[PDB]
Design a protein around this nucleic acid. Sequence first.
DNA 1: CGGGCATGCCC
DNA 2: GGGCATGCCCG
DNA 3: GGGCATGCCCG
DNA 4: CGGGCATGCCC
Lengths: 192, 191, 190, 192
Amino acid sequence: SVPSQKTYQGSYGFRLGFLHSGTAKSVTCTYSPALNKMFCQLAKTCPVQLWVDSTPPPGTRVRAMAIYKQSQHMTEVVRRCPHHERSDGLAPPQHLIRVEGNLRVEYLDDRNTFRHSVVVPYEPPEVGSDCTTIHYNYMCNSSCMGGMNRRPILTIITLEDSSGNLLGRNSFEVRVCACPGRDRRTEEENLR
Amino acid sequence: SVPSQKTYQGSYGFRLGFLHTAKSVTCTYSPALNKMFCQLAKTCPVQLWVDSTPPPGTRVRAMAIYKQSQHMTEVVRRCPHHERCDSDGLAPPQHLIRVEGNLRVEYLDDRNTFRHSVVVPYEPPEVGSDCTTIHYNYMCNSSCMGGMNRRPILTIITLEDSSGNLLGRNSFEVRVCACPGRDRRTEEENL
Amino acid sequence: SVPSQKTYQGSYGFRLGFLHSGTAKSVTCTYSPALNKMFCQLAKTCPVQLWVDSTPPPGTRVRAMAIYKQSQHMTEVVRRCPHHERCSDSDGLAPPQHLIRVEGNLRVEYLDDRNTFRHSVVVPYEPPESDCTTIHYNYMCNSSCMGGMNRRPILTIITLEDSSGNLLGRNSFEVRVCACPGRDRRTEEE
Amino acid sequence: SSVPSQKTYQGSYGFRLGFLHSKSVTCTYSPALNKMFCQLAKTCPVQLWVDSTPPPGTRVRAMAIYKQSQHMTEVVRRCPHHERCSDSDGLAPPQHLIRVEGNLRVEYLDDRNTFRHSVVVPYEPPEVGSDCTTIHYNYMCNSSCMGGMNRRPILTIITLEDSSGNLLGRNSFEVRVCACPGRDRRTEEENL
DNA sequence: CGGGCATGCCC
DNA sequence: GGGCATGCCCG
DNA sequence: GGGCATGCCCG
DNA sequence: CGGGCATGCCC
Ligand SMILES: *C[C@@H]1C(=O)C2CCN1CC2
Ligand SMILES: *C[C@@H]1C(=O)C2CCN1CC2
Ligand SMILES: *C[C@@H]1C(=O)C2CCN1CC2
Ligand SMILES: *C[C@@H]1C(=O)C2CCN1CC2
Ligand SMILES: *C[C@@H]1C(=O)C2CCN1CC2
Ligand SMILES: *C[C@@H]1C(=O)C2CCN1CC2
Ligand SMILES: *C[C@@H]1C(=O)C2CCN1CC2
Ligand SMILES: *C[C@H]1C(=O)C2CCN1CC2
Ligand SMILES: [Zn+2]
Ligand SMILES: [Zn+2]
Ligand SMILES: [Zn+2]
Ligand SMILES: [Zn+2]
């Protein structure tokens, strides 16, 4: 079954935050609140903030998974194109989404659905901060032929206990493109 | 190594011909550039013109190479995406160049140079015709990532005997694109 | 014995020309007239123009050779550093030890001189398509490489030769291979 | 190549390392980073402290590995320039990064199975009136050497072993070989 | 930092 | 055919 | 000890 | 694009 994308704050008040990087043409990543859509470049750092009202228990994990947004493509596993599949020392070459700068990263190929995901332990924010940040990398362009092939995707962020039970969920659309600033302005202008 | 490009009409007067830039054209040839513009997997007719007919057993080989000397040693092959596609029943999935409509087509993977080539027997022109046309197919765009990767290529057409000895050679540049008529006008106007 | 660097226009009025690309920090190759010095990045295209008053005969060749500019280093052969001489930058035609390559010419020829041990690269002269024939040189080590040039400045000598090697003309220019030619040209000119 | 263990192991003899007290200085050790900053080919003293005297024939082996997990499987060796510099003392083969000075009983190993380099000397008990044994190490490449360590930080693994090579103890410390150890220690400390 | 264009694709 | 979608070369 | 030389990084 | 850091080296 297609994994759920429904927003769910859960008993810890789980919410996502994003950096507000603007729409300069050269911007490596930028988030559009009006679209709830992240625009980023291939393999560049894509910060995602985790916000909670109450700290989840030790053993809590944070999983990221991509699915196709269009209903006719939702049952197809999101994976890297054959060119980019051919790197780093921790992530499987087939996985679209990586976590950088975290040696506790763990990747999953699902036994039943064959979907890819990446999971890290939830770590509480630093003494001064009010949120925890994960540095994601997207390893294919949305336009990659033989891969996403111009099909829009969503990234589903799930807060899990140690057993994998759901504690909270949030999602956002992603476009991996060469020009995130240009493309965000173009789509937001097309809301008019 | 690097195969020869030298035009060589040889003992039989071997030369190439091409049919005769709108944005609908499946293929278009530029005499000014000696360059064929064609779309992926669409008919690319090349005419064989000879002054004298070659003997029975003569073969016609086609091979692609990169035009730039910095890439000329790299084997031209299909990109990873299209390699994973669309066979006609005989063409191996990694070969860039195919021949359509010839049951006697042979595809060669050289055991030593690793270069790909496609070979058909030479047929004399039909009654009333003064040339023999072979319908080639290019199975990747010049821009295909992980393949030609926007590098221009040349197609080398060689006339060979059954033993592989050279009888004649010609060549032409080729760009496999989505809008051949458009790119031909741009290149001819950027000179 | 050090190869000659004496400018000689010869019977064909042989001069060099360079593209004027400014001093932006990311410029891949820029020429300073005040210094007669080329600032370029490693393995990037460095255009050198050949200007002649009359077309030299067929068979004419164009050779490029690097020598150290300082007199106390002039007898040392300019070569790549031990690190770079082990890469795979091949290009299919160039020797791994040679500092200077020509890109985009299948008729390129490289020489290790049997007597002087010096490296040079030669291409056939081809008439302009332009008022000038351009050769695309690549320099395969930074001026600062340890065990190679080691921050010593070099001169590139361009010689026009007939098919037998006789001198038809000669010109030269200083070269710095660096990460940021735009920044370094400004610093050296200041 | 498989990565040698870095696990601290005091062993039956309570083996531990010590360092002398610390911008013109040739070497300096930072307790906050467990990191040694030293100059190329300069004396880098390392103290051996034991609670009990190991048996005769015990040896002390030093081996370098890259600290980052990405480069951990790569053998640490001298850059091509320094390997050709012929700056040998007469004992160390030119490819070895780590040398021992002032000990003619030194032995250098090019492991036939792992291809790792190491340098080993006999363990000498502390002299009368002393509490530790000092080995004077030399590092023959800067951390920044192109074609060698190439700005990748390394760890030095010191092992105590018997005559046959069996492990008796292990410690480790990060090391940066640079031109100005005092400047670079101050810089790295001040970034924490 | 990115302007300008290459190149697939849709109307 | 006009124009958009979307990557990238070189400063 | 400043401070420059110079490869590199970062968007 | 430049700003500026990393880092060997010079006064
Ligand atoms: C949104 C709802 C809930 O509150 C839980 C988790 C997700 N769905 C179904 C049950
Ligand atoms: C949009 C992207 C960028 O960030 C710069 C300017 C245009 N493209 C390629 C490089
Ligand atoms: C969400 C948190 C904070 O409180 C500040 C700004 C972004 N992160 C890290 C520090
Ligand atoms: C040039 C090509 C074609 O053949 C049609 C019309 C314009 N483009 C895309 C489809
Ligand atoms: C040298 C010649 C010319 O006259 C211009 C500038 C560079 N080349 C080609 C065109
Ligand atoms: C000067 C060099 C370059 O060309 C760019 C900008 C600054 N450095 C590194 C990348
Ligand atoms: C840091 C190093 C030193 O040890 C002295 C002073 C500054 N540099 C070069 C010499
Ligand atoms: C081992 C220890 C001692 O006993 C003195 C000499 C060396 N080290 C510091 C002081
Ligand atoms: Zn891809
Ligand atoms: Zn393809
Ligand atoms: Zn070098
Ligand atoms: Zn070194």
